[PDB]
Design a binder for this molecule. Structure first.
Ligand SMILES: C/C=C/C(=N\C=C1\C(COP(=O)(O)O)=CNC(C)=C1O)C(=O)O
Ligand SMILES: C/C=C/C(=N\C=C1\C(COP(=O)(O)O)=CNC(C)=C1O)C(=O)O
Ligand SMILES: C/C=C/C(=N\C=C1\C(COP(=O)(O)O)=CNC(C)=C1O)C(=O)O
Ligand SMILES: C/C=C/C(=N\C=C1\C(COP(=O)(O)O)=CNC(C)=C1O)C(=O)O
Ligand SMILES: [Cl-]
Ligand SMILES: [K+]
Ligand SMILES: [K+]
Ligand SMILES: [K+]
Ligand code: NA
Lengths: 458, 462, 463, 463
């Protein structure tokens, strides 16, 4: 059993090591001691989870949202793009600003920006590095950053490396909290009051851990109300919007017609685009600022030709209409999941199971591939184990977050209605079993009995 | 021709922009003001120099050290690598510690680890991200970091985000400074004295800025002597060693047999290996440390199959010996340059008067090996003149100036590659001696050199 | 029946074409990708709506403002104009400044000029080409243009090609915004401070998009205060005013007695005058500027005799007073509409909740006059539902949406014509109140209204 | 008489005006200053020349190439076309894509396209607007435009408005320059090299200023060689070819059998077709591209029925064979002119006094064009004009602001309705000019002016 085998390795990985580290050098003892801190809570990460790719579990976990990886469609365009460039120069040769620039990557960038409705684009090795560059290079002394509390890890790191004086979180997707944070921030800085510095607003368009969507039109209207002099600028991380939201996959910003109102956008390749990389979107002033003040970009090797070609190939497919049907299939399958799971209420009334993104899903203009499923914090591992032993691959969400743990289901275009049925039934089995147990605090459910057994066994 | 066009485009990009932004929104005014800061010292970067790629100028500037890029050898081995995996799964699917792990990347890392004498390898999308991960995940509270002053920018970004309380720089490649740094750090930290924490030493095997080599065997001795309880660990950034140094381009650590002495090694793919990416070498304790405490690795998409394949391909060409002749031709051409330029008649007079200086060429005959990095110094007031003199002669070299180094410490970096020729080297030596001659005559007679007249004329026009 | 047919054809035209183009030449693949851009927001336009012309739907959408088209009144006067010149030389023979000038066109321009109270007139083949010529020929290097944000597309095209250094927009019909724009431009340009160049002010008399009216008197006084040197000039696009506003349809500038104070006026023939073409009014200096510096006029064939004839015929019908009854009936029917819709019981509730909005209808009894243009707003999410509701109810209204306006600003434009009737207006009011009633019940009860169900079913069957 | 009266007004027009404007508003003074700038070089345009129409001068200037206007033949068919449609709806009602479409215009368009051998056709108010629409809507970001340096004003305007990154002119009708333009363009862009963007090639089939013909077969071959992936597209402006070149007037593209190889063609009505309008020819992909991305078309009034009817009438006459004789007569009269002027010549041409390049190797041309440009010394150009005019021969002067200052010339237009006797008179008047200018030259007196100029200079001194 590839699932069970991965389980025993994960079991064996949580065994404490530093008790056996007494004769060992201080450096290695301190490292294994720090690894033991995570092994103690059994939160050590080692080899991850690969059953979703080999066919041994249903893929409700991965970031291959459009199934461009699964089907080989991105690979086929990539090799074809390469074939149309038989003598391509593989190596950039150096820094993007110190000799590593070349026509192909500049043209691919502009082709991407034209597709997304932006003036210019600038390519990074990842979404994370794009966020790092944005919040390192862009904010000025005196600017403030007002951000959604659930922005990405890379956004938090970047803001910490920023020149920005004041950074303020606001409650997730909450319009009143955003208005409070902006007003108070406006009321505490005399160079924001007179418009010589700016309020930077950091949002995700689709939140990777909650699946909700940024109400961008309403936030823009609030920003103007609070900042009548126009001294604000939105920064929108679209990692989970590109290819999934908006016509032909263009993203939330362009779907809403906001490409001229949103100063900086991040569109990453690691999810629906089934590869790696990112572009940062903005005008030439924004682009020049990254080229000159993002030390990370200045001092790293510019992208190789195939890294650019594979990104071109994903945009080729979205541009030529080749992802529209997969994108519609995502909407269909997610809605179908919501329809089923909500039809089978008790467990939700009690606290056993909760899917916040399924509330009022009917009134949503669209849905997202991200389905976070909450249980009781004491039950989260058991929910994870229940689904995995059912041969359902999901991602457990726990160092990443504060008693905020949950599982994240990812619905992909390549999933089927039958697999969704199987997931709905499995979740109901897990529900029913936890209401039974609650209605002997030592009682442990079926899946967790097997896991605890393998823990005793190895 | 082309070189003049690039220079005009460069000149125009330094023209102040804030005077034309008074009606713009705040955000955009202040960004152009920040950019005007750089423009005003003529230090704004936009598209860089491209004449080396086009043939419009000799390549004494790129990082394609073994010319694996120029020849198409890496491209050929890369496409053949994809060919052997006809239906490869392109996408990782997520983070390396969530859904994104797979057999091909684990096996390619292990091939690399085996070939480089390391227990394990862990792949990142660049050398820089490898340094970020090491110094954010490895140092513990109470550790100290003693680093050579010339470590890479990304190691500075790294250390500043680390949990270590003490970071101490030593004068570049100075053993006495290193000894003064280890002892004063040790004696000032009781948790280092009793051996409950470690001193982390940060070096480059080949320093990209100066081109000299780390005295690692002697640095290790100083470290054991200063830290008797063995609470130290060496971190070697081998970005400019891999491919250029050691048998089959294994780098400096393995070339000296120190693969068991150096806890953590960084091997990048952006120079001699002619792609992007990097591997961090260590034992499984180091590796798992990176996978669990390098938040930058945890929250990023794991490399795609073509990314792993091109790295596997570059190492392939090293493993099989297909890079040996290219590695030997760097040693040859570099020694050829040194022999040629030092035999020049102006050489003594230029270096005597202070008009030219090539520190890496001092006593090159005693060196066991040489490197591809040849920094050339003139008088700071002549530096841009030296740079455009070469440029006008259709020789691409790299300009080293602010914001990369302090103002008043500008130089030029000649980079010698496998695919350069003795003809080109001769032309370079001849061009440098002509610049040296011209400055001698100016100093021995408000005259400016010919290269300076040409820049000043372009500046008057643009 | 026919409404459904065109809706199917419209749905089919939005289906993406690029996936079928893989083996086509580069040129053709890239045009269909470009077209797929618009298809992908269901924004592709092909043949538009025709039910209003065929009697299959009531005409609340066309630009045949005085119904001179519908009744054939212009056709008859045009063929009579031809009959009075039985040997007419059809062909101009070349450019208007290179051998295509002739007496008949010069004399028709002068008749139009005298009737509209302007020194001269210069004829173009469209209002658009008139605006192109004005803004490429007139502004000088150093001049500035301050334009209402809602000026016509052709004016945006003319301005982008102009010689003027500064183009400043101002908030639509906003006197405070205009003052800020005039003063900000005045205080940033020394060439305007010493009176060596001019501020050109660009407005519409009747804004095609909103149906409101430019406060021309207030704006001229603001210009005189900010420009005490008198170095300003007004340019008024009267496209939707001629035939509708002012005695015998003379338009807003002559109605206000401003023909001495507005340097350049554009009167188009494509709406109330029921044909095509335009004239630019000014003195002989303005006219000569256009004939010499408007490269678009210089390098195009001067109008044919039948083109001039139909324009003269439309102006005859206005000069003789034959259009005054039709002009007055627009006032009546529009006033009849505002009476009915703002008297419905659902009106307060619909407008309070934001389910219906008709800005132009507010305080309409105080306005000196009304216009034929009646924009109706619902929730953005409900817009196409409202449009299809009207269409299924066999009422032809104009859809206002991207790429014509920004996304999220979509609305519906009702066009009230002289040949509409109170019964038709009754049906429109009742149909609107039916939509508002239905959305009220939905918002108080994923329920979609009836019109949305019919369109969702059509999309299911084809799309 | 009127020839002379035209002169006096044209003389009076050039009198500077801004000196008398010291007290005028800035706006009006600056405009009259701008006019003075043209008046200074005797280059202000006002009323053109009409003597060719009234029979006061021989028409060797106008664009009525087939004499369809002169004979009233187009007028008769036009009125007959209208008569076959007794209840026609004159007014389009609005935008072609927003409610102004109708059956008759779509059918006339398709009838034109079928005759010209094209898949579809799309009607514009003029040839210039057709060019504007093509070059604004068609080029994509990343495409290049390689154009003959002598393309039309409207092509230059349109290109300036396009999304195209690279525009490259090549030496007129020169296949070497065209190949060098294509090669340097293909080798400067990697998206052209991989066939993901296109090179658009812009030519006239018959150049309005030079009378020579585009060597379209060889250019297509050069393009195929330089763009092996087929990522190019030709755009052929046939304004001066329809009705004049090709069997039954079909134009150059169809004559050569290249209708499948030219992506886009422009066929205008203002010359041989003797009215106004144009169509753009292409497949349904090109036509939809214009309908959606030519904002000039989207935001203007669709053509009225009589505008469509008169274009149909022109094509009816070509389709039914009723212009073939006139077309043949142009060929006859043009060749007769070349034979006469060639057999008089050598000395004038050798000295630089007179040149007619289109007369070189005129025997070895497959056909000739109606455009005959006549060159003298730049210092003698208006003098040649005044000589021809006072001889009662109407020709068109071509100078700044239409061509560069030192590229001035006179354009003779030969029409089907001219006679051999008029050609005799033209040849003799031209030889008298040449012999007079030869003498004046050989006399050494740089202050001597010719007989025609004396009368003009005298007319100037008087008024
Ligand atoms: C590999 C981790 C991927 C991942 N998210 C990464 C994100 C990143 C980082 O992008 P990346 O370095 O993978 O190219 C930025 N922004 C958002 C909103 C993200 O969700 C996820 O699984 O939810
Ligand atoms: C693009 C800049 C490359 C560059 N150096 C990058 C280095 C880096 C960063 O490598 P990278 O992020 O490009 O993969 C780490 N260490 C050392 C010693 C380096 O020299 C150089 O030009 O010397
Ligand atoms: C085809 C009809 C267009 C149209 N308006 C055209 C206008 C034009 C262009 O007129 P056109 O070229 O049709 O003769 C100029 N100015 C204003 C204010 C216009 O409203 C409309 O429907 O509102
Ligand atoms: C006003 C008439 C102009 C004129 N030609 C107009 C042309 C135009 C413009 O056509 P138009 O707007 O008069 O219908 C396009 N292309 C070419 C080649 C032309 O020669 C001429 O006398 O040659
Ligand atoms: Cl920096
Ligand atoms: K922008
Ligand atoms: K019809
Ligand atoms: K027309
Ligand atoms: Na944009």
């Amino acid at each position: 059993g590839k699932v069970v085998s991965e389980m025993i390795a994960w079991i064996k990985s949580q065994k404490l090591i530093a008790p056996r580290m007494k004769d060992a050098p201080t450096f290695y003892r301190n490292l294994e001691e720090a690894l033991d801190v995570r092994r103690s809570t059994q939160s050590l990460m080692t080899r991850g989870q690969s059953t979703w790719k080999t066919g041994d579990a249903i893929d409700f976990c991965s970031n291959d949202l459009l199934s461009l990886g699964l089907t080989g469609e991105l690979r086929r365009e990539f090799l074809a793009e390469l074939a149309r460039h038989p003598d391509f120069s593989l190596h950039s040769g150096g820094s993007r600003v110190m000799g590593g620039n070349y026509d192909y990557i500049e043209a691919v960038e502009q082709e991407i920006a034209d597709f997304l409705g932006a003036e210019t684009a600038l390519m990074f090795n990842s979404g994370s590095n794009g966020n790092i560059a944005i919040y390192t290079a862009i904010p000025r002394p005196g600017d403030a950053i007002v951000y959604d509390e659930l922005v990405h890890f890379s956004t938090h790191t970047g803001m910490a490396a920023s020149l920005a004086t004041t950074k303020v979180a606001f409650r997730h997707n909450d319009l009143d909290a955003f208005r409070e944070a902006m007003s108070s921030t406006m009321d505490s800085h005399p160079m924001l009051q007179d418009g010589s510095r700016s309020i930077l607003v950091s949002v995700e368009s689709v939140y990777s851990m909650d699946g909700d969507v940024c109400p961008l039109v309403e936030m823009l209207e609030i920003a103007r109300e609070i900042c009548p002099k126009g001294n604000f600028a939105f920064i929108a991380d679209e990692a989970h919007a590109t290819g999934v939201v908006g016509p032909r996959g263009v993203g939330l910003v362009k779907l809403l017609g906001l490409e001229n109102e949103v100063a900086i956008r991040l569109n990453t390749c690691g999810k629906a685009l089934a590869c790696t990389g990112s572009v940062v979107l903005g005008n030439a002033t924004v682009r020049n600022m990254l080229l000159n003040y993002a030390g990370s970009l200045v001092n790293t090797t510019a992208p190789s030709f195939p890294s650019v070609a594979v990104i071109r190939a994903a945009y080729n497919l979205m541009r030529t209409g080749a992802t529209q049907k997969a994108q519609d299939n995502i909407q269909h399958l997610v809605k179908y999941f919501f329809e089923s799971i909500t039809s089978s209420d008790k467990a939700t009334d009690l606290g056993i199971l909760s899917i916040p993104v399924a509330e009022d899903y009917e009134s949503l203009d669209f849905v997202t591939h991200i389905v976070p499923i909450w249980t009781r914090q004491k039950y989260n591992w058991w929910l994870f184990f229940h689904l995995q032993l059912a041969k359902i691959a999901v991602v457990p969400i726990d160092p990443q977050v504060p008693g905020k743990s949950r599982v994240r289901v990812m619905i992909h275009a390549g999933n089927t209605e039958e697999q969704v049925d199987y997931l709905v039934a499995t979740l109901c089995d897990f529900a029913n079993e936890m209401i039974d147990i609650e209605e002997e605090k030592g009682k442990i459910p079926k899946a967790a009995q097997e896991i605890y057994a393998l823990m005793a066994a190895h």
